[PDB]
Paper text:
To better understand the mechanism by which the Trk system functions, we determined the structures of [name]-[name] complex from V. parahaemalyticus in the presence of ADP (TrkHA-ADP), ATP (TrkHA-ATP), or ATPγS (TrkHA-ATPγS).
As an alternative approach to visualize ligand-induced structural changes in [name], we solved the structure of the TrkHA complex in the presence of an ATP analog, ATPγS, to 3.85 Å resolution by X-ray crystallography (TrkHA-ATPγS, Rwork/Rfree = 0.27/0.33). The TrkHA protein was crystallized in the presence of 10 mM of ATPγS. The N2 domain has a 20° rotation relative to the N1 domain when compared to the structure of a [name] in the presence of ADP. Although relatively small, the rotation of the N2 domain in the ATPγS bound [name] is sufficient to break the bulk of the N2-N2 interface so that there is only a tenuous connection between the two domains. Similarly, the N1 domain is pulled away from [name] and as a result, the HN1 interface is significantly reduced. In the TrkHA-ADP structure, ADP is only found in the N2 domain of [name], while in the TrkHA-ATPγS structure, ATPγS is found in both the N1 and N2 domains. In the N1 binding site, conserved residues of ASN74 interact with the adenosine ring, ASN31 interacts with the ribose, and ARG98 and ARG100 form salt bridges with the γ- and β-phosphate, respectively. [name] protomers from the TrkHA-ATPγS are in a closed state and each protomer aligns well to that from the TrkHA-ADP; however, the [name] dimer interface is almost identical to that of the [name] from TrkHA-ATP.
Residue numbers in the entry:
A (entry chain B), C (entry chain A): 2 to 62, 66 to 483
B (entry chain D), D (entry chain D): 4 to 42, 45 to 65, 69 to 456
């Protein structure tokens, strides 16, 4: 039971160390950097990763799966903190580091380091790299290992997804989703990376910002995300590479199965059909409110600023190319509410994926119709066939658990000395995996108290794991 | 391409895959299919619709539904619109046999090979009657070789005797013990093994001379004369129509309107109207002189509680028909002498078409983990590890023991001093079936 | 359809006018007051109520029922503002008046009049009288007319819920629930009223505060609710007469059926069995946090202050006998969240009645068990027999609609110039029919903007009607 | 007076007649009745019509139809119009139990004694769980004495040891082997007999101290903790409603609409929706930690092919419910540890009312020809051949062996040195049941 689990753990710790080399390689390829902590970590982890599985090389085979994936982030997230503790260039506390470790790996993007512009170019690669690794992590888990467990978030998902579209050669439940999806992952990171080079910026910022936009990310090598270069091209690439990277990757599986027959696979998936409309209606209303307010002198800037902010905040991306200066207070609030409807399910993703909201809007209106025609029979339209009552329950129990954690995690931040508004601005930003505080006056996560910076870590996991995955850990039935 | 996840499809899907051959099964029963998907690729399918059947067949036939009619459509849909090869489809309902020649030898329906279950079991049951004293008869892909099983008792010529003590004489036609089943679990034959009481001693014998083997071991009892049956269904009527000409048959059918048609269809048979446990009917109709009491009903519970009674009255022998094939060893032996399975005979015929020209042919002697197999040795001494090497010098996996060698049309009993020549059909007994791709890799010729 | 409806409307307007007489009678028995607007209103309404139904005395007979009850409060709520508009003593504006009219009739209790202590003793009776009238209104509706409609929210409400326990006969409806329930209503108001006299306070404050506790309103004739006399008896009477009045009145029907056989009827109802535990655990935890904080010098006051505040805020009563001075900021917030768990269904109460929460807690844990045992069959325990899948749907669509309105009504108050925190403090206080703003000593409803007071009226109805009753009004299927 | 020729009526009609008592059975099924008339007088009957029932009763009650409702009418027709004594009538449908107190303790319905089959089996199954390691528990007419059966294996304290070698110590509470069942056939215990492997060793034990006996023989394993069931019917739900309070229950029901009501009726139980052979459900729900796998379905074939699987995965124990009682010994032992029969328990309760005050009470240990009996010795030494005479000095018929003596409320284990006193309830084991009217004539007092 526990034995073969620790085999998996030490095995991944070793694999994490192999990742530590690529940062330190840059701290010697580049001339601005510090490599000793990465190579100090590479060794100590390889040992501590090896020490656990050598006496445990004994192999043996649901209760197994929930406890693995909370260890997959607990173990790897803690290990991620080590480089920051050692390096004195950003002398930063332990909890500030564990936070930045989790915030990176969990693809959150909430930072606690001030003035990272001039920080070494070696620690600046490791932060963005950890988002890439957690970017791959969510994909392999969301589409493969996690659905089987019982929490899907994947079109029709309860525990029965063959991917529906091109459900072929699915035999290896995870061994051909990690292999096949990587090519989409790499072919997406490079395309944007060289595109940023064609926008003009340095190779480093060109690449290490692709690690950040392809995965849900949110990170930057500049304090301001994409205001470093207020150029329409970079925004218009970051916009299209968040919309393309946000939706179901099994719909990006419309390219690796007999070439490019995309449009039928994409548009006939109701989740993508609602991802566009929710994305358009947001930017559309966030545009007319800017034009009516004359917040920006020329409607090209307003178009640029809005169309990026709605698609960087509703996709859980977390990129801030503005300060909402001329924006009504009433816009950062609306955008934060739009954070819940994050990227389409099965992808680097927000708190309640489009379907969870789509299923929620569908079912909520049926409850409005039945009120007049009580003796009528109604069904759900989303897919080809109406949903099983299991899935409709698995959405509405997910909303309940969500607003159960979000309230307990809130009265937990209030007690540590924060204020009602800042707590809400924090947990809604971490439960959904959106780094920005998002208010007219932002939350800057350095000011957050030490004990809260733990509750935020506790919370950003809850969002990254489907909330139930960790909520059942403290159930009596599971143990 | 299959269309079942049943005991047929499941037993095949388990037996046939050694990476030697590749297939795709179809079934709308998900809980059974992805369970059967363990045992390859699964196409969820609705009837014989071309989307599932036809698309799976070309660029990416066995059809085992509940019904025959659905199966025929599937072979026609695959033959009409793609012109797919082979196509074996099970057909149960008798009339599709009664006019088989008109229909099938006119080429109208596209079945390349038929698997008519009612016919196979009834021919099989007649095959035991022909050799009295035989518990089970085993058939391989090669018609020439076959195993014959007997029962060792106190007072038998084979109880307690040393195996090799019987190997010192080679009188007339010779035999060899390829398998020994006792207490339900398998004992592979060794020189050190002794034949204890109430064993299933599986002798090897050339299919031509089986009776000769059993009479040289003094086990060929008097030919059966008086037979009694208990089923009026598809197997019961077929068996009667086969035995009334050579044996004194009596039948027992508890549904009158069906008992009448059996009186019309069977000229020289006595069909009755009664329940199987009707003591009066069994006593009134002279059961203490019955030689075998075949029971061929729907419910396995009824066959046992009636064939146990007929032994008690008692008959000379008894046979039941355990419908599901998974319990054949469990009921067999002891009070009930013989237990027959259609799904260990229907699958027995399917593993002779699928395995054609392949390295292994899975015998009819599959029970539990043990199964007898027939391995083919291709290639001269330069492209084969197992050719020319004497039998005693082959490092066979544990539990495997060679029993015979079929070379063309002549059966050579395996002796330690025998040489395996090229293109041989070796007959051997596996106690554990997890070793096949070891054998399948041993006999298989190296690259040519 | 509309014809016989206006008959009902003008019929009720007449009955409302007959109510106007009792206040003015007090403004002549007392002569510290102004009675002319009540007698001016009595006439003008009687005409305007009579003018509609005289040419419409034509009698004729679900779509009928939803449109009646939005008129029952829209019409009566507007008519309630008239006395305040006319009288110059309040010097109250129109929107301040419509608000105080609705706040009174909707049993909300949110006031916009400063220094009502010295206001006339005639207008001071009318405010409490309107809470009494809306107190009775919810009872007849919730137990009788509303359940038929399909939004009963009373025990196993859904459409079919014909009297629940000891439901014999029940063929006459509204009319056999308006007559019988009045005796409980009157026999409960007097009992507390004379009890306050036995506590010592004046007849007026004794009576006009009974109209308010029983109707779960929260009004007062003093700016501070029950701090006017910090006496344990008045608190301990107001506590016990809110707990008794908050529970199911169909369970208070355990006294008019063959005498006093109470305890079996009460305790075998799971709603009352959860009303106690939720009420105890609240006060229990709201007490230990006061004792650990030394907010009050003697633990008798802390017991007094706490045990009143948890049972005046989580029963939707809205009485304030403190200023949360020594209370942690983190206590008014927790109490405000407890407002959503309003009184038991079938009684004057707040938004998500105990069952809605009880059903929600029940179902939310089942979804946690199934995650480990997917192939198990689970059911709901609440009653004798498990609930139909219709009812489980009718709670989870109610939560969805609730947090759909609560967010639109929030981004509607934000736009009018309020702040994020005050909006939440306002709509959660009005949607739940609470009254007091709560928070770190915050909302005073005079400061609220003119176009927010309208949205607040829009909201307090949404809570008083079961949210769907008015949400379907704007559906295409209803029209 | 009976009204059945079924396994109940037939087993009674066989067991009860030793010329000691006289009865008349009724049944419209002629072929079964005059077959059952062999085993007294047969009244062909239609329902509970008075002509057959009422006229037979006076001047010339047990009612075992297919239905309960017909049975109730018969007891009322006999009670209303003649006022007949006793009246035991089987009632199966649960609700007639759920309101039994209201109905029956109001005296409305005239059943003097009830035989509620669903209740008797479910109480019995709980009686085995309570004593872990017990294959079968035997109950006599006297509640005080009872047999407990165990299974002898290799490594057991009782294998190969001499019987008398265990009789040299009398530690604390004592026991005695009253019966030995092996290979399905009965071995009466002797001093010369040795306890071989896989035997059903039937120990005697005072009903009060049964657990004490099994722990002194080191056979009382750890108490059962985790139980698994497979039936959602009348026995499955009753057992769950009895075990969820003390044991960790899991149920498996394959009919959803019935699986839901089991979720309502059972508060602390986990009921499922699946077939018994669903390997995924058994693996997914931790069957390798199951302690007993009761199977309580309709078809005996399904119970076996599922309880055999649960042992294979495997569970610590397994139990089936073989509906017809005629095969209990055949399925039992070996792979399946325990097999339960309702018609060897329903009849077990009927032979305690009928035999009341009589010479012999037929135990629940009836299997095949062997049956345990309890004989009553009336009369002082002057009017009885068997009173005062020491046990070793009674010329009992062949195969019969005394195992214990019940005197008032105290159980005396039979020793060769024991004296039989007057009005004793002697417990003994008959290997052959054709000897009863020899025993029934031995113990019976001579004329008074
Ligand atoms: N419309 C259908 N299309 C395809 N398969 C069907 C259909 N209806 C029934 N089945 C098959 O029904 C089978 C289960 O019943 P059967 O196989 O007929 O029982 P069985 O034949 O005794 O078991 P076998 O012989 O081992 S397949 C599964 O293989 C199902 O796929
Ligand atoms: N208890 C019984 N005793 C004797 N005969 C029986 C009994 N039950 C059924 N039968 C006979 O068996 C028949 C069942 O046959 P069908 O179901 O029509 O075909 P089938 O015999 O089931 O097919 P197979 O090849 O025997 S499995 C009945 O119609 C009777 O003829
Ligand atoms: N109208 C009836 N009147 C009398 N007996 C009836 C009637 N209908 C059915 N039976 C009885 O039905 C019985 C056969 O079915 P059952 O006894 O119910 O099966 P069974 O109960 O499992 O067998 P048992 O328990 O050993 S009697 C015979 O005893 C018949 O007499
Ligand atoms: N193959 C099976 N696997 C699991 N459960 C089954 C299976 N077949 C039947 N059952 C269950 O057993 C039930 C049969 O119960 P009923 O026939 O209504 O009463 P009963 O259970 O037969 O009476 P008893 O006391 O069990 S003999 C079905 O309704 C299912 O609940």
């Amino acid at each position: 039971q526990f034995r073969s689990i620790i085999r998996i753990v030490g095995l991944l710790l070793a694999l994490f160390s192999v990742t530590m080399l690529a940062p330190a390689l840059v701290a010697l390829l580049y001339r601005d950097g510090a490599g000793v902590p990465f190579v100090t970590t590479f060794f100590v982890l390889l040992f501590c990763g090896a020490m656990c599985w050598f006496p445990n090389r004994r192999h043996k085979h649901s209760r197994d799966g929930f406890l693995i994936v909370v260890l997959f982030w607990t173990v790897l997230g803690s290990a991620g903190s080590l480089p920051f503790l050692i390096a004195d260039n950003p002398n930063i506390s332990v909890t500030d580091a564990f936070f930045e470790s989790f915030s990176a790996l969990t693809t959150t993007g909430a930072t606690v380091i001030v003035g990272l512009d001039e920080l070494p170019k070696a620690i600046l690669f490791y932060r963005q790299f950890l988002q890439w690794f957690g970017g791959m992590g969510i994909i392999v888990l969301a589409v493969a290992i996690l659905p089987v467990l019982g929490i899907g978030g994947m079109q029709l998902y309860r525990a029965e997804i063959p991917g529906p579209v091109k459900d072929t050669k699915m035999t290896p439940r995870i061994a051909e989703t990690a292999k096949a999806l990587w090519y989409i992952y790499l072919s997406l990171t490079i395309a944007c990376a060289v595109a940023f080079w064609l926008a003009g910026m340095t190779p480093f910022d060109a690449i290490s910002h692709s690690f950040s936009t392809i995965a849900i990310g949110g990170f930057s090598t500049h304090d301001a995300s994409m205001g470093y270069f207020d150029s329409y091209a970079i925004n218009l690439i970051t916009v299209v590479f968040l919309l393309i990277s946000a939706c179901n990757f099994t719909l990006h599986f419309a390219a690796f199965a007999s070439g490019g027959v995309h449009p039928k696979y994409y548009w006939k998936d109701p989740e993508f059909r609602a991802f566009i409309f929710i994305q358009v209606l947001l930017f559309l209303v966030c545009f007319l409110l800017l034009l009516k307010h004359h917040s920006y002198t020329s409607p090209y800037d307003a178009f640029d600023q809005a169309l990026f902010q709605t698609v960087s905040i509703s996709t859980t991306a977390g990129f801030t190319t503005t300060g909402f200066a001329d924006w009504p207070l009433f816009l950062p609030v609306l955008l934060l509410f739009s954070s819940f409807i994050g990227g389409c399910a099965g992808s680097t993703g927000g708190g309640m994926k489009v379907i969870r909201i789509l299923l929620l809007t569908l079912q909520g209106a049926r409850e409005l119709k039945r009120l007049v025609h009580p003796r009528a029979v109604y069904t759900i339209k989303v897919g080809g066939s109406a949903l099983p009552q299991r899935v409709v329950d698995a959405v509405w129990g997910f909303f309940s658990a969500y607003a159960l954690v979000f309230v307990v995690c809130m009265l937990g931040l209030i007690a540590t000395g924060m204020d009602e508004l800042s707590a809400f601005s924090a947990v809604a930003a971490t439960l959904n995996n959106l780094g920005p505080g998002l208010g007219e006056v932002a939350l800057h996560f350095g000011d957050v108290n030490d004990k809260a910076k733990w509750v935020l870590i506790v919370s950003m996991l809850f969002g990254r794991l489907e909330i139930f995955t960790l909520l059942i850990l403290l159930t009596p039935t599971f143990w | 391409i299959i269309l079942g996840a049943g005991q047929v499809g499941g037993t095949l899907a388990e037996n046939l895959v050694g990476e030697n051959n590749d297939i795709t099964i179809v079934d709308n029963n998900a809980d059974r299919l992805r369970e059967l998907q363990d045992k390859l690729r699964v196409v969820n399918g609705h009837a014989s619709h071309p989307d599932v059947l036809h698309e799976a067949g070309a660029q990416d036939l066995v059809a085992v539904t509940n019904t025959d009619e659905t199966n025929m459509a599937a072979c026609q849909v695959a033959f009409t619109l793609f012109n797919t090869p082979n196509r074996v489809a099970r057909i149960r309902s008798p009339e599709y046999l009664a006019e088989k020649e008109a229909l099938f030898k006119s080429g109208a329906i596209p079945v390349d090979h038929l698997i008519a279950p009612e016919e196979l079991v009834t021919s099989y049951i007649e095959r035991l009657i022909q050799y009295p004293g035989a518990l089970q008869v085993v058939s391989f892909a090669e018609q020439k070789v076959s195993l014959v099983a007997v029962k060792a008792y106190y007072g038998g010529p084979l109880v307690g005797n040393a195996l090799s003590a019987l190997r010192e004489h080679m009188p007339h036609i010779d035999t060899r013990v390829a398998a020994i089943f006792r207490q339900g679990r398998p004992i592979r034959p060794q020189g050190t093994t002794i034949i204890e009481a109430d064993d299933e001693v599986f002798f090897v014998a050339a299919s031509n001379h089986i009776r000769s083997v059993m009479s040289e071991l003094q086990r060929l009892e008097k030919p059966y004369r008086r037979i009694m049956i208990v089923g009026g269904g598809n197997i019961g009527a077929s068996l009667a129509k086969r035995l009334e000409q050579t044996y004194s048959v009596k039948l027992i059918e508890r549904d009158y309107q069906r008992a009448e048609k059996l009186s019309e269809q069977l000229e020289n048979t006595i069909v009755f109207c009664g329940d199987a446990a009707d003591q009066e009917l069994l006593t009134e109709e002279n059961i203490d002189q019955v030689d075998v009491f075949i029971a061929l009903t729907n419910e396995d519970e009824t066959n046992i509680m009636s064939a146990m009674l007929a032994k008690r009255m008692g008959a000379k022998k008894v046979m039941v028909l355990i419908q599901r094939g998974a319990y054949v060893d469990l009921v067999q032996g002891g009070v009930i002498d013989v237990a027959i399975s259609p799904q260990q005979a229907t699958i027995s015929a399917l593993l002779t078409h699928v395995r054609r020209a392949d390295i292994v042919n899975v015998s009819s002697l599959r029970r539990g983990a043990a199964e007898a197999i027939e391995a083919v040795a291709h290639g001269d001494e330069t492209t084969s590890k197992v050719v020319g090497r004497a039998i005693g010098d082959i490092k066979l996996p544990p539990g495997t023991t060679i029993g015979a060698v079929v070379r063309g049309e002549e059966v050579l009993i395996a002796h330690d001093r025998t040489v395996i020549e090229q293109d041989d059909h070796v007959v051997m007994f596996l106690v554990d079936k997890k070793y096949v791709p070891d054998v399948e890799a041993l006999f298989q010729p190296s690259p040519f």
